[model samples]
Target: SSGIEGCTEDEKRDSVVEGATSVEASLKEQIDWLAERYSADLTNKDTSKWNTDEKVKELLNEKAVGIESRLLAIAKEFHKLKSVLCTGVNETPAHVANRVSPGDAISMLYVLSITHRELSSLKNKIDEWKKVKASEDGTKVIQNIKDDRTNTWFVAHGFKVAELNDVTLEKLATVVNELVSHKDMIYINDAMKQNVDKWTKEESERLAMMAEQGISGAKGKKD
Candidate 1:
């Protein structure tokens, strides 16, 4: 049904991407970052002891809660869907070995969709397993989300936010669709080929300056 384009209001709808934001890329980063915390929370140990600096910890806690709350608020369907996924329901090896039931397949795929970064990061083996599955199965998994329903998942979850605008919304819709549809995918799984690795930011200067990363070293900020 309707998606990012169909979701946004008139004023928030943009003809040109004003900030030229990398929403998809940013989403992956946020997902991965929070996923790490999600795993910690699931582990039953207090992540509070793992890292000091209340601001950083507060940021992580805020991030974890924000993502969790956002997912639940998108709608009741997603609330059940995500709960089954995040905690896992009656998933069985026989079901997986037999390609998983439609309910189970959708369940597993959405779980990945909802908690992607963490699902990707639970362990080297888990991340590696998903990668292998992606390589073998192609993007059939992501496609289910795209063609399934409206932001039934995206809107339910905060992957597509209210303030992100229509074009951005369209982009998200299209990207997730392409993620499912594109068979011979590139850029996402594979690096740019030789000779084509190119960009001229000096000519474009399109990068938007916003918040900076606190955990990672910024340029020469380590010293």
Candidate 2:
């Protein structure tokens, strides 16, 4: 099966036209964002300066943007294998978004894995059934709509979809936008999670520098 990670021979193939370009563009936006964050360090903290080092720079690019040369390679591989995604496969727009997002990771290095597995199983079943045209009688479509309704009801009742972003589907973007649009508010799950994760590694490195220099209570360094 095609999974959405790993390396690719991106150069060898023609760019697959689909939603791939949109996804890549989004990643580029994220990279530009993180690059801004990195550039800002020159003003705020001394030691957190932008790296001219290519490898580390790329890693920085990865955390900020979903698009990385490495990741693009993988995407290409998946695309070529037609395994990158099966449009008719067991997945949703929401599933695809969270899978590619660099933020909203709640479970540390493990990546809220419990949520991942559950979503995976649920998506796989939906995809499998749909892929096989098990709905020859169209019963599948009806049942799926019923299932969607049930999920909507659960979400309306305040259940969590934190296992990933795609769970809430249609309403997820609207709800998240409404939440973030509030005055002086912070998003615990989406933008905020991304911001925190984005900063944590840098902060750790900053502190490590301070520690090595035998300084205490010293703050981050500006470039």
Candidate 3:
């Protein structure tokens, strides 16, 4: 309960000794454990008193704040893990290249693609909420909150859903930006290799063409 279950001190030492692949796996295990714990805590929390009394609502709000802070901390750790893994794969010898094999990349791509979709949907909802707020449509604001499942969770926990959305969006933006930077790194690496191949191919073709022309010219001169 206190220490990470899957990642013991000895395991961490071994991971470090084994290099990026093992380290990445260890980090992933810890992150998964944290995420699972967080989800369980949220699901098991007593919500019966949540809407009954103001004091209970305030207490639950504080509890939710504590839980959410832990979630953010876990996300920060995940970002670090991503940086380490991406850096490893981008290196010349490629510490984590096998982890980023075609199958792995496909899996990662699917997750990121789904994340992008969710982010866009959340952004649209927030934008609509903003528009409703500026228009001073109290009715639409309530309707908007009712329309989204996330807003329901926030409201149930005595939180300001739109304000929470704003904060959530910022966190999401940071994650997305990190992902974009890593993706750009991979693209740049591929582009560099492609350029090298193109240069060699074009240069070889040019040299062969020149040789052929020289032979024909020599024949013309002889004639």
Candidate 4:
């Protein structure tokens, strides 16, 4: 018995290769997407202001574009490893895009997360500016903006996805674009809630914890 077990080296190697290949593919897709997304999204004027923050601009460039090389290198290595394990040696475009290592994947996730906030912070500022501008423009014009913004704010804060396929993903881009239009046309109540005036830090934390556990309380009936 080659290790006192019924398992063969071929079986183990195949299993490991299959899992690694899939993981690598996923990371490649993510790395491509993160870079492509921020590159395009950051072109907005609101996000362009981020250029003033050298640190943020550096992070955006380094993290999004610079990180892709690392991911590609990892994918190349995985493809080589796969060859040794009886998998394909020639990396197709798709294969190159899918390969990833755990370390690279984690780094990509971390960098992407920070960049998202950096982008969002700038745009949300735009949102606030629009709200104030509309507030002063009196003419029910402000009212119209708020109504439009309310729907957007709900989508932005509506802790729900995979739960509502009824809404099109296209609206996500539409809302963000409208919110940053610099016109007096978007309202964003940061602390949006039902009561809007109730809830301590402790209560908020408790509710958040419960909410994560899928234990939300039911809404009241109008009857």
Specify the highest-TM-score model's number: 3
What is the C-alpha local distance difference test score of candidate 4? 0.35
Order the candidates by lDDT, highest first: 3, 4, 2, 1
Look at candidate 4 and give me any clashing residue pairs: 24-98, 24-99, 24-100, 25-98
lDDT of every model, 2 decimals: 0.31, 0.34, 0.37, 0.35
Tell me how many residue pairs clash in candidate 4: 4
Model 3 RMSD vs true structure: 26.2
CA-RMSD of model 1? 23.8
**Across residues 70-175, which tens digit of lDDT does each residue of candidate 3 receive?**
3334333444433332322111221211112223222333333333333344455455444443244433332333345436544553334333323333344345
**Candidate 2 residue spans exceeding 4 A from truth:** 1-106, 128-223
Q: Arrange candidates by TM-score, highest first: which order?
A: 3, 4, 2, 1
Off by over 4 Å in 1: 1-29, 40-219
TM-score of each: 0.19, 0.21, 0.26, 0.22
Candidate 2 deviation (Cα RMSD): 20.8
- Ten-residue region with minimum lDDT total, candidate 1: 187-196
lDDT of 4 by residue, 1-223 (tens): 5577774555344443343454323322333344432223222224222222233224333323323344344334333322231222233333223222333344444434333343355346435535443354452222221234433443353312221123222333344454434232111112111112233455687778887975756777756
lDDT of candidate 1 over 1-223, digit per residue (tens):
4554554446664566578766444433344333332222233333343222233225323322332323222222322222332333221212111112223322232343434333222222222222332445342322222322322434444445342223222334444344433333222112111111222232233333222323433576544
Candidate 3 segments whose C-alpha is farther than 4 A from its true place: 1-98, 134-150, 153-223
Query: How far is 149's C-alpha from truth in model 3 (Å)?
Result: 8.0
